[PDB]
Amino acid sequence: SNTQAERSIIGMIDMFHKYTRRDDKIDKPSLLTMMKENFPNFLSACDKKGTNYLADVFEKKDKNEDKKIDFSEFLSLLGDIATDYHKQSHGAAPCS
Amino acid sequence: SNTQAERSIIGMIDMFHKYTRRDDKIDKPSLLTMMKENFPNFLSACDKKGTNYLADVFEKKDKNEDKKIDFSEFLSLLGDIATDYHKQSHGAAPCS
Numbered sequence: 001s002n003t004q005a006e007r008s009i010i011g012m013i014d015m016f017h018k019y020t021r022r023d024d025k026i027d028k029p030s031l032l033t034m035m036k037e038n039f040p041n042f043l044s045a046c047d048k049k050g051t052n053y054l055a056d057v058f059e060k061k062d063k064n065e066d067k068k069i070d071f072s073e074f075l076s077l078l079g080d081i082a083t084d085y086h087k088q089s090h091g092a093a094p095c096s
Numbered sequence: 097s098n099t100q101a102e103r104s105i106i107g108m109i110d111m112f113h114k115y116t117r118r119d120d121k122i123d124k125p126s127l128l129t130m131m132k133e134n135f136p137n138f139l140s141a142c143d144k145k146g147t148n149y150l151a152d153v154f155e156k157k158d159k160n161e162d163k164k165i166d167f168s169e170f171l172s173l174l175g176d177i178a179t180d181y182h183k184q185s186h187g188a189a190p191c192s
């Protein structure tokens with residue numbers, strides 16, 4: 001009964017919960033695992049352009065520097081990845 | 097070859113582009129149409145709780161008051177809907 005858009009949002013929440021600890025936040029090795037498992041094609045397009053996105057993603061997105069990614073920070077990471085795909089739809093190179 | 101997470105992000109960009117005008121932004125009647133077509137179950141759960149989410153969504157999310165929703169504002173709207181589903185996963189009532 002859910003639409004594709006509702007299923008995508010529920011799916012992204014359920015993906016976040018594969019990787020959280022008991023405080024409902026994701027630690028650094030779990031974030032990097034999450035990226036490799038769920039965004040491998042995005043990560044390959046970055047590598048091809050000489051960008052290792054996992055080198056700095058945790059430090060970039062851990063805004064409050066508590067060394068965990070909470071849901072708000074995870075949504076900011078998904079916004080960055082979406083922004084990259086949106087710019088590619090307008091003719092930008094991947095990972096720009 | 098895309099994963100479910102990459103397909104969800106590409107799908108949400110493609111959904112945004114069903115509803116944009118030529119300036120790559122969505123006007124108010126098109127935003128409301130987008131919500132009804134793509135988030136009907138979310139909108140039903142809101143109605144059941146006495147909240148008509150379409151009454152104010154455009155004015156809430158049009159941050160720069162140019163009377164269009166651009167991609168950044170659309171991503172903030174998807175973050176709000178995701179935040180609601182995330183709170184429901186933690187035992188909150190829908191549309192809280």
Ligand SMILES: O=S(=O)(O)c1cccc2cccc(Nc3ccccc3)c12
Pocket residue numbers: 007008009010011012014015016018100101104
């Ligand atoms: O939930 S699914 O319906 O497969 C799904 C549906 C839609 C979007 C999804 C996005 C990321 C991960 C999923 N799978 C997933 C699989 C195991 C645990 C957590 C997420 C997605």
Ligand SMILES: O=S(=O)(O)c1cccc2cccc(Nc3ccccc3)c12
Pocket residue numbers: 004005008103104105106107108110111112114
């Ligand atoms: O693209 S689909 O592969 O169907 C798709 C796949 C994954 C997530 C989607 C989310 C919203 C709309 C879609 N469909 C859609 C259909 C027509 C135009 C724009 C979006 C989604």
Ligand SMILES: [Ca+2]
Pocket residue numbers: 061062063064065066067068069070073
């Ligand atoms: Ca943090």
Ligand SMILES: [Ca+2]
Pocket residue numbers: 157158159160161162163164165166169
């Ligand atoms: Ca605007």
Ligand SMILES: [Zn+2]
Pocket residue numbers: 017024071182185186
């Ligand atoms: Zn949670």
Ligand SMILES: [Zn+2]
Pocket residue numbers: 086089090113120167
């Ligand atoms: Zn666009």
